[PDB]
Every structure is written in structure tokens, then in C-alpha cells.
Amino acid sequence: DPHFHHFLLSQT
Amino acid sequence: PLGSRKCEKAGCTATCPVCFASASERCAKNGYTSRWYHLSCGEHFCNECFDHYYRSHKDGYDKYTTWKKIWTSNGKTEPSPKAFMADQQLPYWVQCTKPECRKWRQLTKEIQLTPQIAKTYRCGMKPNSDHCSLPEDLRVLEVSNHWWYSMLILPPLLKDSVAAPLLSAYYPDCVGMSPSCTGMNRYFQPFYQPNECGKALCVRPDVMELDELYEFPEYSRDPTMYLALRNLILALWYTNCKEALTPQKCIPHIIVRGLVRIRCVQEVERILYFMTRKGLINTGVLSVGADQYLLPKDYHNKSVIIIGAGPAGLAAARQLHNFGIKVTVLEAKDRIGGRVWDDKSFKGVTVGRGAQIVNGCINNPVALMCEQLGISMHKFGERCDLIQEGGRITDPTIDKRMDFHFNALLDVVSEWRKDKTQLQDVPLGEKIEEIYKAFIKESGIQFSELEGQVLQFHLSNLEYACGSNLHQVSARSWDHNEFFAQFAGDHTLLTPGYSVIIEKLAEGLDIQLKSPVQCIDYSGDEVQVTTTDGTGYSAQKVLVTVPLALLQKGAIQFNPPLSEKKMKAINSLGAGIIEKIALQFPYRFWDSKVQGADFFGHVPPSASKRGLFAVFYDMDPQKKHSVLMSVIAGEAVASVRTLDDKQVLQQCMATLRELFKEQEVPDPTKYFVTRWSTDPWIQMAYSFVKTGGSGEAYDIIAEDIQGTVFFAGEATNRHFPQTVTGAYLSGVREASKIAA
Ligand SMILES: Cc1cc2nc3c(=O)[nH]c(=O)nc-3n(C[C@H](O)[C@H](O)[C@H](O)COP(=O)(O)OP(=O)(O)OC[C@H]3O[C@@H](n4cnc5c(N)ncnc54)[C@H](O)[C@@H]3O)c2cc1C
Ligand SMILES: [Zn+2]
Ligand SMILES: [Zn+2]
Ligand SMILES: [Zn+2]
């Protein structure tokens, strides 16, 4: 879920 | 000949197994034993040492049971003899720190490796010659082999990790630390706590992130080693964010028995470079000399032109420069900063003409940068009295009541939107006004004139946040970014101003002021960048960080042109706008009535005055100097466009005299009135989603063109639109993409 993931480590 | 000289493990390359434990008086040493136990291709222990701990009647069983208990009570992996051996008995390995030697050495079994020993070790060193010349053990070079780790039985577990104090709520072996182990800035909370709700820029210490899996797929099967090292690295960065974290700094903090330590040390470097490139460490206002670049030379062979020297452009430039990449920034104006512009000529006070508030300090790069600079922020008090024209302080229950109703109106909007598409989007303002009248009519509750005026104040707060009257903003998408984890914690006034951060980011960079870009040509081998006076620049890559309004106006000619898809996204966002007034007084006239609150509200007399100085801010939290700042938002920006600065001042002073009706108000001795809307290179305050638009537009604008033209700025950050923080992170994001 994108409600959690680190912005800088979700760029792919 | 009774016993074996072969390892139990099929495919093992150890032609001669020796026992590392020598714990039993009966140890087989290098001779024949019943069974050779395999910890790694270079590490085995004999059957009797196995038994010395394993069987109840043997003397090492006492130690095994006490360890098994501790392991079992705060661990998740099996407490096997191989696990006991690897955690408690395997000898340590340490690398000689003599630059021309650099050989790995096994320590004698009684020696407990510490950071200090690892930091200074050289061959031969003992607590009680020609040691460096003696050959390196052959098992060392073996660790490099691709298969070595696959032939290693259990994953390494780190001891006394710098991360441990922050992970006390996890089981150590789930985070790659040993179960047998027994004043950081309060805004640094880089690790999720178990089953804690979402917050910005947080990692799970027990789960690899998408980009991590992508770069290190070899770890998807077993992430223990990666996680331990990543968490260690982060914990080290946050414990000392004022210097660059290097492999040399990390290595003494990697404490684990066995040859596996060699594997760990060999991995920490790649992991560190990854976290650097991505912007998790070695970031903020850290600046590094030519001899100290943050990424190896293989990243260095490129050139970048960054257009705009606001938070986004400077963040990217700072990152790329620090990496060792060649960077030139082109700025249109005679100053850097963009929508960061501070006035420091107010006696003993810094007042921002643009940004000055930090919304959510926990894990906020701005808070990291304040730590690095040793500057303090002021956390806002909760108290904000709503003062009526002229004098009456509004009953807090009326304030709270109308706030409740305003949020209720928003709640029903979020019900209405659930089955609507972009083609069906209505203005938020229209939808609110509609639901309000429907609620007024159904239950015949009439609100007093004051209650209606207080609702109007709350409405103006949302227009303030959006940078627009709500009739231009999307009912579907106004709060789209709330889908993503947001910054937790304090909302603060950045008393010294964002300019302090901006100036530090910029120091030592190649920045060309008064160089407004007019043309970007990316049809050839290198990007051709032309300024409005015809000056030519070129690089392999170009990053555009100009404000949304400037993209919407087409101020820069792109060859080839931007795609229709990009143009549609660009035009689907709103160029929001607020303006500020700051006033210096000879004395703090408001102290008697305001009583030290950070701000006070101004109840609008009528709908036509909504957003006209809705909130005044006391700009000295030390309560010594006399500076007020106020905002012009929503429809009030329009009413102000054809007024000169003197006239805006007059209306503000008229407002204040009404608000403090029962007292004299001195004349201001100094003031400014901002004109962001008509600043040719800015033309806005911050973005919002216009009716018919989607949060996806931020992603679409952010999308690079042919790995050649890159985009950053607050209007390219879907998670964190509008803010200096979001603009800063968009720059860090693009620097990562560009460096790859
Ligand atoms: C009055 C006001 C109050 C605000 N309050 C806050 C606040 O309290 N907290 C907060 O977090 N944010 C606040 N913001 C928003 C915040 O300042 C912006 O989101 C942020 O500065 C955006 O950064 P940026 O790098 O994206 O854009 P910018 O800051 O706008 O910088 C872009 C740069 O691009 C340059 N440029 C434009 N065109 C060209 C060209 N053709 N060639 C070369 N250069 C060009 C411009 O001159 C500018 O310097 C406020 C903004 C305003 C105006
Ligand atoms: Zn073996
Ligand atoms: Zn033995
Ligand atoms: Zn040596």
C-alpha cells in the first residue's frame, strides 16, 4: 500500500 | 582412518576441514572425526565440539541452554548448534588498516572484536615480527566467489548495531541483529514502529522497499544481511548528520563472528552508495570537497544544466555536485531562492516574503538541515483567538462548532466523489455551498450572523491552504496527496528563515544569475540551452525546475515540444496564489489582548472580505520585537491587484484598528507588500489541482523525457505538493534519476 512506502525508495 | 576428512555438505570446496571451536578436550582439530559440520566453505567444527555443547552430559551444555533460552525469548529463528557456533564461538576476522597491507586476519578465539579494535587493527596486534608480510589465509579470497554466500548456512546477525536502540520493539533477528545482545534529534524517526500508521520518509526495518528490491534482487530471497547493513547505515547517518558517512566509518560498526564479516564489509560499500544516490544519507546541506565526492568516478562522467535556483533546483544541484557530477545552474532573477525570499532588515527579526512555515517536522529534510546548521525552529502554540471587528474575542465554542460543520461539509464531499470521474468533476466551492444550503433547508437550523462569519473564516483557511477561491479547485482531487503518508509532528515557524538553508545549499555551486532560459533544444547529441539575451549553454542532461505558471505560459521553448499528455497535466493544475504583508511597529501593541499567542484570527465582516488579512502572525517568538505578518488569500488577492502598496497598508491598518478597537494602534515604521502574482519568473505562490484534474498530473509533469530532460519543483511532487519540503525532495528525486 502506497499509504506507507518511502517516497525516495518508491521511484521505480 | 576411523572418522572423516570430508565435509558433510555436498559441493563444499574445503579439501581440509579444521575445527574452529576447540571447545572439547576431545576436539578432532585437523584430524579425523565422525562428522565435519559446515558453517561455510572455510568454517567447520568437529563432532565432539558439536556434542560438547549439544549433549546434556557434556560441560558446554550449560552455556548452550542459557543461550538457547535468550535466543528463544527474544528471537524468531531456530536456536540450533550452528546458530550457537556462529553467534558465540566462531572467531572474528579483521582487516589490517595499513594501506599497503590491507590483509584480513583471524583473531584468536578469546578476543572479542570491538569498533576500536577494527578501527586501528594491524597484523600482529595483541592486548599482551614482520606480521604484515605473512601470507593472507586462502579462505579470505574465497569469500568473493559468487557461490560462497550460497554455501554459507545461516545469514549473519549484527552485534551492538547503532540501529539497535531505535529498534527495541522488533525481534533482533527480523532486523538482522543478534538476539543475544543486551541524544538524537527528536525529529529523526527513520524507522517504522511495528504496526504504526503511515508517516513520510519512513522505512520498515524488516522489509526491503521497492527500489531496494529492484537494485539488489539477489536479496529478495533472504534480506537479513541487506536489512542489517541498511539500518546500520541509516542509524549512523542520523547519529551524525554533520559529516559524510563513508565505508571506512561504517566498517568498525559491523560486528559479527566469522568469514561472513568479510562479505558484510564488501557489501556495505554498494549499499552506502545506493542510499547516497537515492538521498537517504549524505544529504541536506552537507557539502564535500573535490577529493571527497560521495559517489565513485563511474558516476562522474556527465554534465547537467539546472534551470532555476529555488529549493528544487538547488537541492538537485547540491546532490549532483556532491556526487561528483558537473553542474551549472541558470537562474532568471538577480537572486537565488525563488519563492524563498527573506527580509532581514526588520530589527532583530527575519521575515519571509515567501515560505517560512514547516508543516510536519518528523523526518522532514528541513528539520535535518536545521540540525546540520544548528538552528532552532519555533513550534506554534495551539491558541488562535478569532477577533471580530471591532474588539470582541469570539467564543471558542462558536469557533469549534463552525469548524466541526465545515469539516462535516468536506466529509460529505468525500462521499459524493467516490463514484465520480474527472469528466464529472465539480468545483469544491460549488459543492460545499450546495451541501450547506441542503443542510440548512432540511433541518431548519438557522445560524447567527456571527456563526456564519466564523464559517467564512474557516472557509478562508482552506482557500489559504489551496492558494485559490474554492470555485477553481477540484472537489474530487483537492486533498489527493493525503492518499500518501504525510509528515508527522510539529508545525513550526522557521525563525532564521529558509534563506539560511538556501544559502548553504548554494555555496560553492556554479550559479549563473540573471540568465533567464528561453530555449531548450534536445534534438541533438547534447542539450542546447539558450538564455533570453542569446547566451548559449550545453550539457548532456537538463533539469527544469521553473514554477508551474511559467510552464503554463510557455515561457520556455522546447524542441521537440512537450507532449500533449504533459501539456494537459501542466494545464490541469492551478497556479495558486497568496500574498503577504509585514509591518514593523515601535512597540508590541497587541500583548494585552493577544497574551503571547503566536497568531490571531480576523473574522471576516462579510463574504466579500473573506481572506483579507485572515490571520496575523507574531513574528518574534521571544516576544521582544514588534513585527506582524498577515496573508491575503482567495478572492482578496484579486481585490488587491489594482491597489498600490500604500493602499494595501491602509486597509491592513484599518483592519488592525478595528480588531483592537478599544486601544490605540501605533503607525508602522517599516513594511512590505508582496507581489508574487506579478513577479514575471514566478507568478504564483503554490500549486493545487484545478477542477477536472488529477493528482496523477504531478507524476506526469515529473516524468523525464528520453532520460534527457528532467522536471522538478513543488508542482512535480504528488506526495508533497506546494511546500519547500516537497520542492526540495523533488530535486533529490531527480538527482537520483540523473546520477543513475
Ligand atoms: C507567499 C508564499 C508563502 C509560502 N509559504 C510557504 C511556507 O510557509 N512553507 C512552505 O513549505 N512553502 C511555502 N510556500 C511555497 C514554497 O515557497 C514553494 O513551494 C517552493 O519555494 C518551490 O520551490 P521550487 O523550487 O519549486 O520553485 P521556486 O521556488 O519558485 O524556484 C524556481 C526558480 O525558477 C526560476 N525561473 C523561472 N523561470 C526561469 C527561467 N526561464 N530561466 C531560469 N530560471 C527560471 C525562478 O526565478 C525561481 O527562482 C510559499 C510560497 C509563497 C509565494
Ligand atoms: Zn564444508
Ligand atoms: Zn572441535
Ligand atoms: Zn598488515
DSSP B129: -
Count of C-beta atoms within a 10 Å radius of residue B592:
10
The CA distance from B715 to B722, in Å, is: 7
**Ligand 2: distance of its center to the CA of B390 in Å?**
87
Q: Outline where DSSP puts E strands in B490-594.
A: 491-493, 511-512, 517-521, 527-531, 536-539, 541-544, 557-559, 573-576, 579-584
Q: 3-state secondary structure string, B54-71?
A: HCCCCCCHHHHHHHHHHH
B607 close to B591: Cβ distance less than 8 angstroms: no
**Ligand 1: distance of its center to the CA of B348 in Å?**
25
The CA distance from B273 to A12, in Å, is: 18
The nearest alpha carbon in chain B to A11 belongs to B211
Name every residue whose Cβ is closer than 8 Å to that of residue B217 and which is 6 or more positions away in sequence: none
- At position B619, the amino acid (one-letter code) is M
Which residue in this structure is represented by grid cell 514566478? Answer: B682
Q: What residue owns the CA closest to ligand 1's atom 20?
A: B724
Pocket test for ligand 1, best of B580, B686, B688, B718 (most atoms within 8 A of CB): B686
Chain interruptions in chain B, by residue before each (C–N > 2.5 Å):
128, 182
**Cα Rg of chain B, angstroms:** 32
B308 pocket-lining for ligand 1 (C-beta < 6 Å):
yes
Closest atom of ligand 1 to B550 CA is: 38
**Ligand 2: distance of its center to the CA of B221 in Å?**
22
Helix axes B396-416, B449-466, angle to 10 degrees: 60
Closest CA to B480 of B697, B311, B200: B697
Let me know if B117 is exposed, middle or buried by CB neighbors in 10 A (0-12, 13-18, 19+).
middle
Q: Are strands B573-576 and B686-689 parallel, antiparallel or unpaired?
A: antiparallel
B275 close to B230: Cβ distance less than 8 angstroms: yes
B685 pocket-lining for ligand 1 (C-beta < 6 Å):
yes
Count of C-beta atoms within a 10 Å radius of residue B438:
10
Nearest-5° angle of CA B140, CA B144, CA B147? 115
Closest CA to B325 of B346, B298, B307: B298
Of A2, A7, A12, the CB nearest to B200: A7
B201's torsion region: left (phi>0), alpha (psi -120 to 50) or beta? left
Partners of B192 on chain A (C-beta within 8 Å) are 4
The CA distance from B728 to B685, in Å, is: 16
Of B198, B211, B485, the CB nearest to A9: B211
Closest CA to B631 of B608, B595, B599: B599
| Chain A residues interacting with chain B (CB cutoff of 8 angstroms) | 2-12
The CA distance from B709 to B452, in Å, is: 50
Ligand with minimal distance to B36 CA: 2
Let me know if B597 is exposed, middle or buried by CB neighbors in 10 A (0-12, 13-18, 19+).
middle
HSE of B346, CA atoms in CB hemisphere, 13 A: 28
Let me know if B247 is exposed, middle or buried by CB neighbors in 10 A (0-12, 13-18, 19+).
middle
B714 pocket-lining for ligand 1 (C-beta < 6 Å):
yes
End-to-end CA distance of chain B: 58
Q: What is the DSSP string of B166-234?
A: G-TTS-GGGTTB-TT-----TT---BPPTTPPP-SS-B-TTS--HHHHHH-GGGSS--HHHHHHHHHHH
HSE of B19, CA atoms in CB hemisphere, 13 A: 26
| Chain B residues interacting with chain A (CB cutoff of 8 angstroms) | 192, 198, 200-204, 209-212, 214, 278-280, 483-485, 719-720, 729, 732-733, 736-737
Nearest-5° angle of CA B523, CA B524, CA B528? 85
The CA distance from B200 to B203, in Å, is: 9
**Ligand 2: distance of its center to the CA of B152 in Å?**
9
Query: Could you tell me which residues are beta bridge partners of residue B709?
Result: B542, B705
The CA distance from B110 to B467, in Å, is: 67
Q: Do A10 and B209 touch (CB under 8 A)?
A: yes
Name every residue whose Cβ is closer than 8 Å to that of residue B499 and which is 6 or more positions away in sequence: B337, B340, B341, B342, B344, B350, B352
HSE of B80, CA atoms in CB hemisphere, 13 A: 10
The CA distance from B632 to B648, in Å, is: 10
- At position B225, the amino acid (one-letter code) is M
Q: Which string of b and e fits B716-729 if b means at least 16 CB within 10 Å? A: bbbbbbbbbbbbbb
Coil, strand or helix at B384 = coil
Q: Do A8 and B485 touch (CB under 8 A)?
A: no
Query: Could you tell me which residues are beta bridge partners of residue B521?
Result: B528, B559
B724 pocket-lining for ligand 1 (C-beta < 6 Å):
yes
B618 close to B590: Cβ distance less than 8 angstroms: yes
Ligand with minimal distance to B311 CA: 1
- At position B686, the amino acid (one-letter code) is Y
The nearest alpha carbon in chain A to B720 belongs to A7
What are the CA-CA distances from residue B673 to residues B598, B601, B633, B644, B650 (Å)?
Answer: 21, 19, 13, 9, 11
Let me know if B443 is exposed, middle or buried by CB neighbors in 10 A (0-12, 13-18, 19+).
exposed
B350 close to B364: Cβ distance less than 8 angstroms: no
B490 close to B379: Cβ distance less than 8 angstroms: yes
Query: Could you tell me which residues are beta bridge partners of residue B628?
Result: B583, B618
Name every residue whose Cβ is closer than 8 Å to that of residue B618 and which is 6 or more positions away in sequence: B590, B594, B597, B598, B599, B627, B628
**Ligand 4: distance of its center to the CA of B51 in Å?**
36
B205 close to A9: Cβ distance less than 8 angstroms: no
Q: Do A5 and B720 touch (CB under 8 A)?
A: no
Percentages (nearest 5) of helix, strand, coil residues in chain B: 35, 15, 50
Q: Are strands B517-521 and B386-387 parallel, antiparallel or unpaired?
A: unpaired
**Binding site residue list of B for Zn(2+):** 7, 12, 19, 27, 38, 44, 46, 49, 96, 101, 123, 132
Q: Outline where DSSP puts E strands in B670-711.
A: 670-673, 686-689, 709-711
Coil, strand or helix at B677 = helix
Q: Which string of b and e fits B123-158 if b means at least 16 CB within 10 Å? A: beeeeeeeeeeeeeeebbebbeeeebbebbbbbbbb
Let me know if B483 is exposed, middle or buried by CB neighbors in 10 A (0-12, 13-18, 19+).
middle
HSE of B244, CA atoms in CB hemisphere, 13 A: 19
**Ligand 3: distance of its center to the CA of B179 in Å?**
25
Name every residue whose Cβ is closer than 8 Å to that of residue B454 and which is 6 or more positions away in sequence: B386, B394, B398, B399, B402, B603
Coil, strand or helix at B123 = coil
Pocket test for ligand 1, best of B330, B546, B615 (most atoms within 8 A of CB): B546
Closest CA to B417 of B408, B406, B428: B428
What are the CA-CA distances from residue B444 to residues B439, B441, B514 (Å)?
Answer: 8, 6, 61
- At position B63, the amino acid (one-letter code) is K
The CA distance from B665 to B661, in Å, is: 9
B725 pocket-lining for ligand 1 (C-beta < 6 Å):
yes
Coil, strand or helix at B538 = strand
The CA distance from B109 to B79, in Å, is: 21
Q: Do B211 and A4 touch (CB under 8 A)?
A: no
Q: 3-state secondary structure string, B4-17?
A: ECCECCCCCCCCCC
Q: What are phi and psi of B28, to 5 degrees?
A: -75, -10
Q: What are phi and psi of B111, to 5 degrees?
A: -80, 125
Ligand with minimal distance to B136 CA: 4
**Cα Rg of chain A, angstroms:** 6
Closest CA to B521 of B511, B513, B531, B512: B531
Q: How far is A7 from chain B (nearest CA, A)?
A: 6
Partners of A12 on chain B (C-beta within 8 Å) are 210-211, 214
Which residue in this structure is represented by grid cell 560486528? Answer: B255
Q: What residue owns the CA closest to ligand 1's atom 7?
A: B355
End-to-end CA distance of chain A: 15
Which residue in this structure is represented by grid cell 565440539? Answer: B49
Say whether the peptide bond before residue B115 is cis (omega within 30 degrees of 0).
no
Query: Could you tell me which residues are beta bridge partners of residue B616?
Result: B600, B630
DSSP B473: B
The CA distance from B719 to B355, in Å, is: 19
B356 pocket-lining for ligand 1 (C-beta < 6 Å):
yes
Q: What residue owns the CA closest to ligand 1's atom 13?
A: B355
Task: Please state the separation of Cα B715 from the chain's center in Å.
Answer: 17
The CA distance from B679 to B681, in Å, is: 6
Task: Please state the separation of Cα B318 from the chain's center in Å.
Answer: 15
- Torsion from C-alpha of B424, B427, B428, B430, nearest 10 degrees: -110
Nearest-5° angle of CA B147, CA B150, CA B156? 120
Closest CA to B523 of B561, B566, B560: B560
Coil, strand or helix at B550 = helix
Task: Please state the separation of Cα B541 from the chain's center in Å.
Answer: 25
B93-96 contacts at long range (C-beta below 8 A, 24 or more positions apart): B93/B140, B93/B258, B93/B259, B93/B261, B93/B262, B94/B118, B94/B121, B94/B261, B95/B121, B95/B251, B95/B265, B96/B121, B96/B122, B96/B123, B96/B132
